[PDB]
From Swiss-Prot, chain B:
Record annotation: effect of changing T30K: In strain: Omicron/BA.1
Range covered out of full length: 516 to 565 of 1273
Superkingdom of the organism of origin: Viruses
Main function: Attaches the virion to the cell membrane by interacting with host receptor, initiating the infection. The major receptor is host ACE2. When S2/S2' has been cleaved, binding to the receptor triggers direct fusion at the cell membrane. When S2/S2' has not been cleaved, binding to the receptor results in internalization of the virus by endocytosis using host TFRC and GRM2 and leading to fusion of the virion membrane with the host endosomal membrane. Alternatively, may use NRP1/NRP2 and integrin as entry receptors.
Stretch list, region Disordered: 4-24
This protein's name: Spike protein S1
Amino acid sequence: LPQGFSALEPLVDLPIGINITRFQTLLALHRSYLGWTAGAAAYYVGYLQPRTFLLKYNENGTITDAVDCALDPLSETKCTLKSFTVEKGIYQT
Amino acid sequence: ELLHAPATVCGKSTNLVKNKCVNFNFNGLTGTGVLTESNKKFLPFQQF
């Protein structure tokens, strides 16, 4: 996994009225005709939860930074103050 | 069919003027003002 920050853009939207509960990841592999060989898949799986985020926009309209408002007290202080830099003091959160 | 899914079957666009106080309807957004050409740049998936 990299050590940078990249944002995701909406690729496709679809109108679908069906109910969805499970997904199955299709996989095809090289046929050496010796015929499918061994596999070396390297795909990762994660899941989403409701969270509150604070995002930063530049002059070209792209996203440069973000902060999660519930990770540690400093993040919540930044979330309450509505800023990215703070000074010394005591704050009520 | 009875409307149980989002509606998709249905289906004007008068001319365009600029630099004067006019009423505008841009895809459902209604308002009044003065229309002038700008120099801002949009990413190619943003409407307004």
